[PDB]
Design an enzyme around this catalytic site. Sequence first.
Site, mmCIF file in Angstrom:
data_model
loop_
_atom_site.group_PDB
_atom_site.id
_atom_site.type_symbol
_atom_site.label_atom_id
_atom_site.label_comp_id
_atom_site.label_asym_id
_atom_site.label_seq_id
_atom_site.Cartn_x
_atom_site.Cartn_y
_atom_site.Cartn_z
ATOM 1 N N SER A 32 0.776 -1.092 0.078
ATOM 2 C CA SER A 32 0.068 -0.092 -0.036
ATOM 3 C C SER A 32 0.704 1.399 -0.032
ATOM 4 C CB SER A 32 -0.943 0.059 1.307
ATOM 5 O OG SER A 32 -1.901 -0.745 1.007
ATOM 6 N N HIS A 63 -3.240 0.519 -4.763
ATOM 7 C CA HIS A 63 -2.637 -0.557 -5.637
ATOM 8 C C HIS A 63 -2.947 -0.346 -7.084
ATOM 9 C CE1 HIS A 63 -2.716 -1.923 -1.404
ATOM 10 N NE2 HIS A 63 -1.753 -2.872 -1.928
ATOM 11 N N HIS A 85 -4.941 -9.353 -1.603
ATOM 12 C CA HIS A 85 -5.173 -9.687 -0.360
ATOM 13 C C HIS A 85 -6.103 -10.686 -0.072
ATOM 14 C CE1 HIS A 85 -3.261 -5.773 -0.703
ATOM 15 N NE2 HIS A 85 -2.763 -5.935 0.638
ATOM 16 N N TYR A 87 -8.478 -10.396 2.437
ATOM 17 C CA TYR A 87 -9.769 -9.854 2.822
ATOM 18 C C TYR A 87 -10.497 -8.995 1.348
ATOM 19 C CZ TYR A 87 -6.504 -5.616 2.204
ATOM 20 O OH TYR A 87 -5.858 -4.325 1.687
ATOM 21 N N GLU A 88 -10.057 -9.269 0.507
ATOM 22 C CA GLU A 88 -10.782 -8.837 -0.936
ATOM 23 C C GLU A 88 -11.336 -10.106 -1.537
ATOM 24 O OE1 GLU A 88 -8.185 -6.803 -3.859
ATOM 25 O OE2 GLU A 88 -6.681 -7.116 -2.598
ATOM 26 N N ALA A 115 2.640 -2.067 3.945
ATOM 27 C CA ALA A 115 2.499 -0.898 5.184
ATOM 28 C C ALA A 115 2.007 -1.697 6.137
ATOM 29 C CB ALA A 115 1.572 0.051 4.557
ATOM 30 N N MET A 218 -1.841 -7.458 6.672
ATOM 31 C CA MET A 218 -2.927 -8.477 6.050
ATOM 32 C C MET A 218 -2.276 -8.957 4.911
ATOM 33 S SD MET A 218 -6.065 -5.944 6.696
ATOM 34 C CE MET A 218 -6.386 -4.631 8.135
ATOM 35 N N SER A 219 -1.056 -9.002 4.684
ATOM 36 C CA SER A 219 -0.359 -9.414 3.438
ATOM 37 C C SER A 219 0.864 -9.759 3.769
ATOM 38 C CB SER A 219 -0.404 -8.408 2.539
ATOM 39 O OG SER A 219 0.606 -7.412 2.840
ATOM 40 N N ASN A 242 1.794 3.568 10.832
ATOM 41 C CA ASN A 242 0.836 4.260 11.572
ATOM 42 C C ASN A 242 1.238 3.376 12.991
ATOM 43 O OD1 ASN A 242 -0.437 2.206 10.050
ATOM 44 N ND2 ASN A 242 -1.862 1.928 11.902
ATOM 45 N N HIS A 256 -6.784 3.956 6.314
ATOM 46 C CA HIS A 256 -6.110 3.909 5.107
ATOM 47 C C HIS A 256 -5.701 5.313 4.581
ATOM 48 C CE1 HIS A 256 -4.705 1.060 2.043
ATOM 49 N NE2 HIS A 256 -5.297 1.671 1.058
HETATM 50 N N1 LIG Z 1 -3.707 -5.313 10.221
HETATM 51 C C1 LIG Z 1 -3.224 -3.804 9.921
HETATM 52 N N2 LIG Z 1 -2.837 -3.578 8.648
HETATM 53 C C2 LIG Z 1 -2.437 -2.559 8.396
HETATM 54 C C3 LIG Z 1 -1.877 -1.859 7.184
HETATM 55 C C4 LIG Z 1 -1.775 -2.334 5.753
HETATM 56 N N3 LIG Z 1 -2.323 -1.602 4.712
HETATM 57 C C5 LIG Z 1 -3.705 -1.935 4.316
HETATM 58 C C6 LIG Z 1 -4.465 -0.874 5.226
HETATM 59 O O1 LIG Z 1 -4.350 0.386 5.446
HETATM 60 C C7 LIG Z 1 -3.904 -3.443 4.658
HETATM 61 O O2 LIG Z 1 -3.643 -4.171 3.288
HETATM 62 C C8 LIG Z 1 -2.799 -3.912 5.818
HETATM 63 O O3 LIG Z 1 -2.060 -5.026 5.455
HETATM 64 C C9 LIG Z 1 -1.678 -0.535 7.620
HETATM 65 N N4 LIG Z 1 -1.708 -0.302 8.897
HETATM 66 C C10 LIG Z 1 -2.406 -1.612 9.352
HETATM 67 C C11 LIG Z 1 -2.837 -1.828 10.752
HETATM 68 O O4 LIG Z 1 -2.573 -0.956 11.814
HETATM 69 N N5 LIG Z 1 -3.125 -2.973 11.082
#
Ligand SMILES: Nc1nc2c([C@@H]3N[C@H](CO)[C@@H](O)[C@H]3O)c[nH]c2c(=O)[nH]1
Length: 278
Positions: A32, A63, A85, A87-88, A115, A218-219, A242, A256
Amino acid sequence: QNGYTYEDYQDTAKWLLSHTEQRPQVAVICGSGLGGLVNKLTQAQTFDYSEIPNFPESTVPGHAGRLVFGILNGRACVMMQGRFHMYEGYPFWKVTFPVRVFRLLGVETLVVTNAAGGLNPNFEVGDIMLIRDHINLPGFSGENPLRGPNEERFGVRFPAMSDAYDRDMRQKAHSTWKQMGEQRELQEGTYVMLGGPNFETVAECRLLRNLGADAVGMSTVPEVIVARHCGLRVFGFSLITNKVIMDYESQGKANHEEVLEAGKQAAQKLEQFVSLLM
Ligand SMILES: Nc1nc2c([C@@H]3N[C@H](CO)[C@@H](O)[C@H]3O)c[nH]c2c(=O)[nH]1
Ligand SMILES: [Mg+2]
């Protein structure tokens, strides 16, 4: 389980090999807000995921959904400008499909990026964390891209994962950072992957840190498992976008939007690191 046949991967590698003269030796998957790592490639040839048979499609903002071949710091690479991912709606066998195609293309080393929210309290937004190891939460339940009959043409039934992230490359990556001229050092730690798409609760965050994780996303993890399965050398890093909220008073809320913004503010630093790294 896995729905792709050996021939499916072949078909696609065949397609790519006949549409570009490029013979990439390295593969980079841009997470991301990290699509800009494509920018410096020379002799670049782009293909939208939509035009490549069998390829899934990126539907997350940040993306691009393009596969770009080219030369970067002398090295022939192919970059996934955007990834897939779970979740998609994609089973891991779809998410990791490109990885096996890369192996078939002749790629030998895979660098994964993403990210991630920081769990280690000493991480700062903007920090780059070398992935020394991972914790595969979905794998604990059987959600694994390797689930199903094993294709010996890719790898073995039970591949080891304790040596997944090439130590040599992490050593190098650190000295390369020295040459960067960056103030803040290059962090290193354990990345934990969970499903998503929602961000963590405070309890979850505390729980994950106590599992020994420094960053969560999540990846990445499923790509690494498939890469190792087929023998690819793996190197990876997370950009701490973050700090996950670990207290009930924080007005803070993961989003996001801020994640993509942090990616943009760091894609430059990342641009040179990955290239010098080449
Ligand atoms: N689980 C999780 N994912 C993300 C991400 C990643 N970037 C996307 C969400 O902004 C998702 O694909 C995740 O993998 C950024 N910050 C976080 C966070 O605090 N927690
Ligand atoms: Mg060309």
